[PDB]
UniProtKB/Swiss-Prot annotation, chain B:
Its job: Plays a role in clathrin-mediated endocytosis and trafficking. Involved in regulating AMPA receptor trafficking in the central nervous system in an NMDA-dependent manner. Regulates presynaptic nerve terminal activity. Enhances androgen receptor (AR)-mediated transcription. May act as a proapoptotic protein that induces cell death by acting through the intrinsic apoptosis pathway. Binds 3-phosphoinositides (via ENTH domain). May act through the ENTH domain to promote cell survival by stabilizing receptor tyrosine kinases following ligand-induced endocytosis.
Misc note: The affinity of the huntingtin protein-HIP1 interaction is inversely correlated to the length of the polyglutamine tract added to the huntingtin protein in Huntington disease.
Tissue: Ubiquitously expressed with the highest level in brain. Expression is up-regulated in prostate and colon cancer.
Organism: Homo sapiens
Subcellular location: Cytoplasm; Nucleus; Endomembrane system; Cytoplasmic vesicle, Clathrin-coated vesicle membrane
Signal peptide: none
Family affiliation: Belongs to the SLA2 family.
Superkingdom, taxonomy of origin: Eukaryota
Subunit structure: Homodimer. Binds actin. Binds HTT (via N-terminus). This interaction is restricted to the brain. Binds to IFT57. In normal conditions, it poorly interacts with IFT57, HIP1 being strongly associated with HTT. However, in mutant HTT proteins with a long poly-Gln region, interaction between HTT and HIP1 is inhibited, promoting the interaction between HIP1 and IFT57. Interacts with CLTB (via N-terminus). Interacts (via coiled coil domain) with AR. Interacts with AP2A1, AP2A2, CLTC and HIP1R. Interacts with GRIA1, GRIN2A and GRIN2B.
Protein name (record): Huntingtin-interacting protein 1
C-alpha cells in the first residue's frame, strides 16, 4: 500500500499539532490562573489595610462624639 | 499482504490517539474556564469590598469633620 503511507504521515502531523496545543494551553492556563491568584491575594492584603484604616477613622469619631457629649454636659 | 492490513491497523490506532487528544483539549479548556471564572468573580467581590471600605472611610471623615466643627463652635460660643 502507498496512499495510506501519506495518510499516516498526515495523521502524525495532526497528532504533533494537537500535543503541541495541549502543552501550550496547559502552560498558558496555569499562568493566567496564577496571576489571578496573585491579584486576589493582593486584594486581600489591600482590604485588611483599608479595614484597619477604616476601623481607626470610625473610633476617632466615636471618641469625638463622647468628647462632645462631655462638653455639652458641662452646662446641661 | 504488501503491508496493507498493518497500515490499516496503525491508521486506526492513530484515529484513536487523535480522538483522545481532542477529548483532552476539551476537558482542559472546560476545566480552565471553570477556574478562571471563579477567580475573576472573587476579584470583583474583593474589589466591591474595597469600594465599600472607602465609602465608610469617607463617611467617618465627614462625620469627624462635623463632630469637630460642633466641638470648636460650642466652645467658641461659650468663651463669650
Amino acid at each position: 500500500k502507498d496512499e495510506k503511507d501519506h495518510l499516516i504521515e498526515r495523521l502524525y502531523r495532526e497528532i504533533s499539532g494537537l500535543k503541541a496545543q495541549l502543552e501550550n494551553m496547559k502552560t498558558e492556563s496555569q499562568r493566567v490562573v496564577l496571576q489571578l491568584k496573585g491579584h486576589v491575594s493582593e486584594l486581600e492584603a489591600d482590604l485588611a489595610e483599608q479595614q484597619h484604616l477604616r476601623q481607626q477613622a470610625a473610633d476617632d469619631c466615636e471618641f469625638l462624639r463622647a468628647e462632645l457629649d462631655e462638653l455639652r454636659r458641662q452646662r446641661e
